[PDB]
Amino acid sequence: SKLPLLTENGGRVNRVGFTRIAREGSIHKFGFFYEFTQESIDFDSDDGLM
């Protein structure tokens, strides 16, 4: 029922259109940290703690 049949007379028949889409992504920020005192590394048994 939707075939682009064309007659001998031509004319403005079977005009089509096009479209495009836009994709998108974004970045976000992350991070974490830890704290320590001088005594927690100086008096700690393990010198390789850090």
């Binding site: 100086d42 008096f43 700690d44 048994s45 393990d46 010198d47």
Partner: protein
Amino acid sequence: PKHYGKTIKVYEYVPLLDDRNINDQGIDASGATIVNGNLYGSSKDIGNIT
């Protein structure tokens, strides 16, 4: 030094002839077991020492 906590410990070695040398190793001159293993300890009495 580092990595040994905050406490310092040291041994004191009591002399053989001391009243606070309390041990159960005592065997007397005749071979009998005695309650003291420090000979006469801190005694200064001639009778006890003899």
